[PDB]
Task: structure prediction
Amino acid sequence: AAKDVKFGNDARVKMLRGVNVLADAVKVTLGPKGRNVVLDKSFGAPTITKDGVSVAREIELEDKFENMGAQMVKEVASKANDAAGDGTTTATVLAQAIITEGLKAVAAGMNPMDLKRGIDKAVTAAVEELKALSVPCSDSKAIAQVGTISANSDETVGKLIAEAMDKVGKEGVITVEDGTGLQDELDVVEGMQFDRGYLSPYFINKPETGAVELESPFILLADKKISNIREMLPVLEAVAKAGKPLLIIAEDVEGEALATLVVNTMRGIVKVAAVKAPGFGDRRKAMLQDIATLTGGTVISEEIGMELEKATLEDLGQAKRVVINKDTTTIIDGVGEEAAIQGRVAQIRQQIEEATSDYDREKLQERVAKLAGGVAVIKVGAATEVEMKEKKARVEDALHATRAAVEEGVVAGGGVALIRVASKLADLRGQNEDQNVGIKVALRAMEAPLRQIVLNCGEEPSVVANTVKGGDGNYGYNAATEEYGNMIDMGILDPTKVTRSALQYAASVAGLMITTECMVTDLP
Amino acid sequence: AAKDVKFGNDARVKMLRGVNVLADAVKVTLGPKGRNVVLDKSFGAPTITKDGVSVAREIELEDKFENMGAQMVKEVASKANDAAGDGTTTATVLAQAIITEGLKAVAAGMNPMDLKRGIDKAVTAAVEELKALSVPCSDSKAIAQVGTISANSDETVGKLIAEAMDKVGKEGVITVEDGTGLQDELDVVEGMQFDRGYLSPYFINKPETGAVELESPFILLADKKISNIREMLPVLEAVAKAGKPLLIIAEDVEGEALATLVVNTMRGIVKVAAVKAPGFGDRRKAMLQDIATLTGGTVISEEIGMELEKATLEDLGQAKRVVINKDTTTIIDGVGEEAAIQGRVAQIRQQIEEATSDYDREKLQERVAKLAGGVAVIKVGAATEVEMKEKKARVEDALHATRAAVEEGVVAGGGVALIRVASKLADLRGQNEDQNVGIKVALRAMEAPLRQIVLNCGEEPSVVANTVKGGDGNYGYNAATEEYGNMIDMGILDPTKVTRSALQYAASVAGLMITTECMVTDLP
Amino acid sequence: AAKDVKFGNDARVKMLRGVNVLADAVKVTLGPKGRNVVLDKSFGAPTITKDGVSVAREIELEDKFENMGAQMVKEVASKANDAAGDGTTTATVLAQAIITEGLKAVAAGMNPMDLKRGIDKAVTAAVEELKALSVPCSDSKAIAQVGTISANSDETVGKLIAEAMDKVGKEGVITVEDGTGLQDELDVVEGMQFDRGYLSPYFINKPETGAVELESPFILLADKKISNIREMLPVLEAVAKAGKPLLIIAEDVEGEALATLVVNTMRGIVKVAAVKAPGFGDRRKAMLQDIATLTGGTVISEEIGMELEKATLEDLGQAKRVVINKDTTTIIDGVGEEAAIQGRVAQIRQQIEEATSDYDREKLQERVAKLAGGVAVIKVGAATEVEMKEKKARVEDALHATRAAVEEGVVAGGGVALIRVASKLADLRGQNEDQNVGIKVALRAMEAPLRQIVLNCGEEPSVVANTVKGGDGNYGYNAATEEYGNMIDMGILDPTKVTRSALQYAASVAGLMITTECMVTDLP
Amino acid sequence: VAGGGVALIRVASKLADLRGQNEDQNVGIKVALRAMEAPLRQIVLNCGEEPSVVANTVKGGDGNYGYNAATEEYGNMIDMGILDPTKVTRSALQYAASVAGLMITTECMVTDLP
Ligand SMILES: NCc1ccc(S(=O)(=O)Nc2ccc(-c3nc4cc(NS(=O)(=O)c5ccc(Cl)s5)ccc4o3)cc2)cc1
Ligand SMILES: NCc1ccc(S(=O)(=O)Nc2ccc(-c3nc4cc(NS(=O)(=O)c5ccc(Cl)s5)ccc4o3)cc2)cc1
Result:
């Protein structure tokens, strides 16, 4: 296929056009008073959304160079959201600002590598300042407070989140499932969660939020790397006859008779999901055996001669539900026997006591934690159905916010933290002049979120930015109530993880954007 | 007429294109290894020149806005040559470089006024450094050395210049005229010079150097403003029947009936020039009476009732030769009586000794100096006419260079003083960031002369610039012979006045042209 | 007017196209087998010629920049013909070849100044080789042989030339004029010649060779510069009533009221030409007084108070005929008295014998030689008028060739001396690589004349060039009869002056043309 | 051998006196020598500095003295740890020469029309 190649200024201006289109699409949905974006679905009536990621998903330009310029920003900005729970729009706005300023500097003719180094230095210093400004949130009162604030000031959601955290532990696994009535329920069911996302994104279930759920699935434990379909056929027929979902944790499902075929051909015949075996080597085998004990299944290992051709439905495991997202995978509640699971935990604890190096100690401690800890499940309930679904949505939003807060603390939101750290990092200087200009670019681009929020509200960005910068500490501006004060007290806060991740990822996007020299793409 | 108006960056880019065209045309002649420029002439064979002044004069562009830029740069750059005798090309190159960098910065979104202030501050500091670095040239031996250096190591020219300066004084009047044989001549004759240029540029005589010469002219002195042609017609007829040239020294010539008629109607029938009387008020009358005494004429004044129509040839003054240029008029050798001039000088000295204020003493003393100083005229001799004219041109160039040197000392030539003062000001700072950007712009375009000179030589400008900046003092790179060392020792030197004037005028052009926002012109 | 400016390779290619057009037009007439060139004339039938001078004169191109290239080549090439009497086509061919190769080398990325220096060094070495290779022509027999060779082996022309040079001296003045019958005549008459050409090219008389002739003219001698037409009006009326031509010898004629009027207004009513007086200073006055003594006129001088308006026909001088060309004016036969001329010559010889310096002795001796040498005039006789004019043209061409030969000897013709000196310099080296490339460019274009001559004959230029280079000394190739041998014996020879002048002028054109960077011209 | 293109610049500097039979061979030698400076010039340009000054400074040195593009410092490249096997440089030089020789002496080019 013939390629189209561009160098120098043309490549950078095409990239800038793409990033500008994407940012102008997503920046208008930022802030408590964001505008609306009319997303179009060819089926019927259009979709009105104030959500940033929903808008960013559809954006795909015509021109190939601009399309790539938008795609890189969208990709490396989605990491902030899927690693912190929010910040896609903030990361995109920061990336747009840094990219446009750096590209103008490069067009002015200054060493791009020095600019990238200066931007990285400024971002590192800003991250340190954000760590300095964080307000710790570990007590149950603070946990409940953040839970309420995230879920539109609903005390019941905060109470439920606090109860779940004190039951399963601050580092434990919490999942919110459906409910049966007005009352909400909480229970610690036995389960585990390992960080292996879906193989193919087309495995996505009905939820469009990058999630897959399988009610009463089948767990197949193939420790070896599976590539052929013929020895799958007995298990496929058994699972089809049973009708329950089928989840295959395995060493790796390759681009062979599996994966590719399972995506399209099994798209709507038997519901399935694909995840890799957690760990590697002996760790992978141990994970396989623990999952077999948990889900009541048997490990089909070729090392002792057992062959996936003969895999009875009894060898298959099953649980109440399994949730597979982009990176993690949780088993809610398997059908394993509590006595057998307890015995396995006991023997692994013995292995802990007779461990040799600290590495073995910590890995086996993780084993016993995942085994014995279990999974706490919140059963959100309400009066009507729609009330139920809306409250459930509020619940997982609050859960993600609370997890981020208890991880890295909480800082004033609404873009005030970035403006504060940018104001305090005024004396930062680099070796050469280009590094200094890069520091200036990063510092000025840290003001984009607050300015865009104020502009979305319809006020004058400059006056509000000056007033907020003139203050100190957590003093900022409430875009909702158009008043000034300590953003923490008045209920406008943000987890430190979200802001730090957004800033760092935007810096990475800008660094990769500025130092580019050539783009190769297929011609129209 | 309907106008065409442009705002913002459109005017900036048109301006930049015009200045780029003019500077690209001019700067290729810079340095001892300057290239050739072919200028079209409709009379036949083209003219091949290495003179930047002619190339700048011939430049005129089609597009009106680019023509604005070129004309403004040309007009303000020619002032450096007029004031110092050299430095048009250097001023043009400096202006182009500062202007390009400033326009790029302005397009990058910086306050133009702060940029202009920073450029002005940097230029002022560089001027102070240049004044600190200059080597004085006061003794006769240094004067002769500078004359020889400016005259391509011709010891005879330096000896002649030194003798003339010793005879007439360092601030006296020295004129170069045609000799009558092989041996050179030097003598002092009665005359005076006042800083009043020609009224109309269309008065230019045979020489292309911007000067006029009248051989044995008649001098008319009228303290009254003259605007209609009726009152001096008998004087014009008398001077026409005489056949000798006529010079107008009036209070002012208004373009109602004189300037138009004298310029257009008179285009070969006679040879007439008009200049304004020096000074104003009673000082103007004193100057006119002194001129009349020196030239043997009489003052036509309305106060005494003397009327122009009755002025005869007796009232007209006579001189051997008069030279008028852009901003200076000199009388070489009048026909006045020695006794009358001496008596008037004694009377003015008596007025000096009975003066009562410093201002009166200063003006009367400079009047006496002008009257009694005389004019030292140099006659150039050679074997044949062609070498005669070449030596005359060399002598006048060396005289201008020596006058500048004795006025303000000498520095290292070849655009090395500018790079020295640029190196010495690496730590300059301004009020804010924009002033710092302006200072950096200023101390990055002062290397343009040396880089252009090296580029004309075919070498690598960056290597030579780094090597020169590595050294200290007058150490530089001799472009003529491709070697390093002390310029003052090799005989490469420029007067401090020419470098300072070029830098200041280029800074003025850049300041006026960066802060330009709107441009108005006639339609194409 | 709005100008059009081109930089870099654009000017180079436009200039190359113009030079290529002119050289392709001219070079096809080179050699004894030159082709024909048809020049259109609006009066009727076209003109078919084999003369390169006419073709070069008629060439003018549409595009302005190509016109620059052609005009500069034509200008600097015609100087060779003016100085030596022949060699315009050879200079044009050499210039075209050197310029083509040099522009190719420059486009290959080489320092143009180094290329120019190498070309100049190679040309200097070749000039030394040519001076070493020349065969002297001093004795009368050699003079006659060269005259016959230049006059198509006409022994009568050679005998006449030898007799003329014997009678008047090798450095005397010889003129060819019309005879009165069949037998040729030769006599010595009083006259003088000074190197002052016509002031305006529009003074050209009937002949197309660039000269003017006045039959029994009147000579006006005015040491004063003339710029207006009033004061010699009575002289003009007197000369118009007389009806004989009038010749102007003044210090300088300015284009204010004479040159414009004398050229445009005078276009057939009278016949007048104007030339500058020889010398400058007191030497100019001596020249004028000698001319007045020789022609019987009187000097109109302002120093003695003599004024032009009172100059009668008695003051005017008279001669039999005067010839003026581009850079020489000669008086053939004045009407001055023999006794007065002899007395003045004796007085000047007395001044010589009482002279005190070498310069004075030299100038006075050349004055005496000019005054007392006389002019030897040759009258051409033939059976009919047409053969008469053809023989006169042959005689003047042979006279020019013989003068060049006796000035600087003779070498082998047919462009073989150039190939000899090119072969002898195969081991020339420069300072750096670019200078060596310059040498190679120079010593590859000196074969262009011989290759073009052979190509015009229809043979193979490479074979003949190799065969000639294989020989040594004066051995060469005869294009007329297609044979080899010592061409000095075979009757093909050229004066060393014409070859040296063509080489040097072509080198000058190439040097000015390689180092050209910017070009300015009016819009189309 | 010293890496970072310093070995090629060093051998090109050493081979200044190389000469051929005719003039075209000499020009080919000059072309090859000038081309062996491309790696260092391109590396310096990628770093953002001025290629000419660094190239002149490295060529003026001797032995393994070169330019460390990572730390923007001069000295012995072997000691700082900027190394390159002789095979990697020799094979690249020879193969580039082969491509240039095959592509210079080409005269005709036949391909299917668009
Ligand atoms: N060492 C290479 C080199 C080359 C040339 C020169 S030069 O002095 O000849 N010319 C020159 C040209 C442009 C600049 C420049 N500074 C910029 C800054 C920003 N950041 S920004 O947040 O909008 C912003 C910052 C401050 C504001 Cl006010 S707005 C964006 C674009 C900029 O362009 C600077 C200098 C100097 C140095
Ligand atoms: N025997 C055939 C023949 C034909 C014509 C003539 S000719 O003397 O009439 N004209 C003529 C024209 C071009 C060249 C020439 N030398 C070159 C060299 C380089 N190498 S390069 O590393 O860039 C480089 C080397 C030095 C630099 Cl400085 S840059 C690249 C292009 C070059 O073009 C030479 C001569 C002479 C000989």
